[model samples]
Target: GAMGSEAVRSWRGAAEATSRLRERGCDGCLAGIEVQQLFCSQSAAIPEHQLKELNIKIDSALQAYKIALESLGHCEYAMKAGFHLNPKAIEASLQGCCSEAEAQQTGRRPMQCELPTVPVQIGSHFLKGVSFNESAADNLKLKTHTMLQLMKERDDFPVTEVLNQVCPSTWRGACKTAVQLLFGQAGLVVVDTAQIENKEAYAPQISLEGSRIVVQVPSTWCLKEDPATMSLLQRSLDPEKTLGLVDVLYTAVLDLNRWRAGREQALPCIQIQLQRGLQKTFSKLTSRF
Candidate 1:
């Protein structure tokens, strides 16, 4: 009998009455942070000696990742699709990071009014796709910190200091070797704190040939063919495989976008990119994935 309660109760009544054209496009909300399950307190023994530095590094990475996620998302989409970037979409998403009061209002702040976009090189920000938040950054920071501390606590810490004393590349090489050894003992590949002493060789770059992605089925189609395709890691020099590599790279980036959207739809995409990343890195003798 109470029409006063009608607003809250009439979920279906206005469903047909809403306008789609006036749409500000999307709600623009990013996904919630993933709550990880940890059996033990990993951050507990973060070397107090570098506790402050550790925390700062983690926080810095987190902020960088957030700003970068928005930028990288668009770059990935544009690189895959021939579509020119909807600068409006990225600007809109960056605006998504606005304060609650700023978002609650039903209007967009003008570009002249908003902060300028930061320009960053892809390699520097590309991995931000995976590291783009507090939890993600924490995972990496803690991994690095813990491994370093663990090495010191162990009696046989690879005795890297002696090698360093004898060689010019010792300090940097020892750090990398120490981390690899530590991770090997743990039955894990250290995705976090991973380093290749000379990664300049495997660095990311746009094809000078141009960004138009072309996919040609040079291979004769067979019904028994697995939809699961292989991508070349280091260098797929065969023109067909190179084209496949380009397509694979595009798909990997799109999958990364879905992952950022908090959609695990990119799992297969991630696996492919990872394999490709590892494959490409192999040419450098340690650079894949």
Candidate 2:
């Protein structure tokens, strides 16, 4: 429930709206495992008659999009790139448009086209950077990089930077939230901003106010939710993380032992109670002796 649960919950709630689609057997939008392989793309799977209707929808919607793109950036390049936005997705983006033309006609809301957005390097794709093109499709109807992680990644958008912006005060919260999300929910380990001196690192800072800004890294995670785990998680999340899994896991295991010390106290104080019971039973037996 750290941070994105509200949004994730809202998503699940909407996904539930279509959850009853059992005709083809699916729980919500998720395809049923039975024919999961064949469920395929709705654009590709439906009957041709239905597809013709879709094609008409696609064409009308395409026209509407053409009319709509008169002012936005890179319309030609998007087409040249062989980029195509799916119709059902366009409809959903339009919030169940009354017609394909309406769906094609975008509003203040954005569309996901084949645009080059922030790109993390090859080994670093795991880093939480802005995704563009088809990659932006499922993170929701909004255009890629419009909100949340994408928004947080931008250098100037401001709501406080998630990249080590504002420290001590902002560090823990940013580590717990942004670091965790971008790096996976595995706790975050953030070093002082000065720690990330080189450019090869993957640690991103969350913008928090200014002046005191710093970034976080996911390092060693024994998986227990603590500062140590956060540290390991931060280390692990570093874009420049070059350590082997064995090394990371070894360190994490060490951290786990440290993290579990608190949970260990929950063990019952049973010695005194056991002694009392033993004495009572022994006394009864001794009386017979």
Candidate 3:
């Protein structure tokens, strides 16, 4: 419950970096190190290798935010340039990272990155409606962490040098919902959370002249939609078909949330944002539930 006494001892440099930007609105970059430091301090019981793995995962989370913020021209270049970056290419880097916290220590520390509300540019193809609402964005963020947690349980879950690409399906689901709520219905835009190498060319900033409404999320969602595993993955893109895929994916996320809650291990950040998203997306109906 209390701040780790040795928090400064183990991570003085990280703590120092956080102080400068601590006062600013944590659109994304500033909060990276803060969350990493907190996670590190609590990881006293974890082995060094696992500690490294966890840090790498945290770095991926930070990278997603940093990349997006940079594209928006919101963050100063030197801010991230000066910060410590963990090793990217890893061989089973996440190997010892525990799924459930072994220690009963509860985290009271506030997360530094508050989900941004500045609506991203939606493509004109989605002229019906388009949005990147805060609640949806918040859920997107939580999905990153929740996936990491769930990974602890599934050895089959993809693990590689990059955490963003760990599960592509999850990433697209978040993007799909955001686009659906903001743009028109599904199939309108191909929500690709990858293609993040060029953030500016990514989602939002819809190509007005273009017919296809393809969108992008800042981070990677690595889960490959294998038609062999799930028949839905095989279908060609059509407005109706796309809508169906998005519906299925959103329901999956909702199911995941419900499952996590049933175990009382649901991420508070996720639950909060998801609840708000439901309310915002469907106030009259969702509110009653």
Candidate 4:
């Protein structure tokens, strides 16, 4: 056995060094490039064009690391002389060993160490929570569109100030759980529509006063025969209804505004009216049936 041979022992030392170097270089290269890529790609502020360039550099570093690993393997095989090696294979291994030796002597030349620092330049449209990575961006985009579509489909869902305020910051964890308990039980979806411009002349005038939402309806619109009003009365009379009529009315205010302007706000109480004499106010806390 060549286990105790001085030549074999020397080969082992060289082989270990090559393996160690390859591991260190490759690991450093992969970690450095991947971390940088993650940092840059996760950000929403960076330009798409710049990320493409960053990706190119990352690919080159990966390729160099791969080549170094291959070289190390060949070098190790050449150093261990017991195997029945082919002449061309031996020549190729020798060349690889020489190349690695040259590379080592030049200094600590890990692919990551030679990589240039990547700068962070902010783009014109900096949208928060959006990833620069195409797949991640698409995921967020799809999620956002789905939420908007849900809101659009259900106009009776209240788009209140409190709901809107909480929607962006608290949709995924405790808030989501709370929402599920509150609205999901009743089978309602809360919609948060932002920056809605009044597009139509016939749109209802909606305003917030303390905990009450007020909507000014057209004078010709009969409150008694209105579907919304009839629905509210029905719900108000139902002893088993989990949600209050006031809650439904508040939602209707936002829903009417959303239909015209694609915007909404929140409140606990609601008043629908043609005029002061014809107006009816409903409240979850104070109104008597």
lDDT of 1: 0.22
Name model 2 segments beyond 4 Å from true.
1-45, 73-289
Tens-place lDDT per residue, model 2, 1-289, is 2223333332233323322211111232111121222224442255556444433433333243323323222211000000011333323422321222433542212112221232222111222334444445443223224423443434334322222121223222222221111111111112122232332333322222222221222222111112332232122233433211100100001112222353211110010110003234223322321
Q: Candidate 4: where are CA atoms >4 Å away?
A: 1-46, 74-289
TM-score of each: 0.17, 0.18, 0.17, 0.17
Q: Report residue 217 deviation for candidate 3 (angstroms).
A: 7.8
TM-score of 3: 0.17
Task: Report the C-alpha lDDT of model 1 over 1-289, residue by residue, as the tens digit.
Answer: 2321332122112111211101121232121110000101333333454444433433343343334323323111111111112323322322323222322331222111110121111221212112234354444343333323432333333222211121212122222221121111111011122223443333322111121111110000101101111011111223221101111121112222333355433110111111114234234322324
lDDT of residue 257 for candidate 2: 29
lDDT winner, 2 or 4: 4
lDDT ranking from best to worst?
4, 3, 2, 1
Per-candidate alpha-carbon RMSD to the true structure: 26.1, 28.0, 24.1, 33.5
In model 2, the worst 10-residue window by lDDT is: 245-254
- Highest TM-score: give the candidate number: 2
39 Cα displacement, candidate 1 (Å)? 8.2
lDDT (Cα, tens digit) per residue for candidate 3, span 1-289: 1122222122233223223212222343322233334445665344556555544544444344334323333211110110011212110111111111211111111111222221223322211111344355454444434333433433433212112321333243333322222212111122223323433322222111221222222322221221211222222323322211111111111123334355322110110111003223223221221
TM-score of 4: 0.17
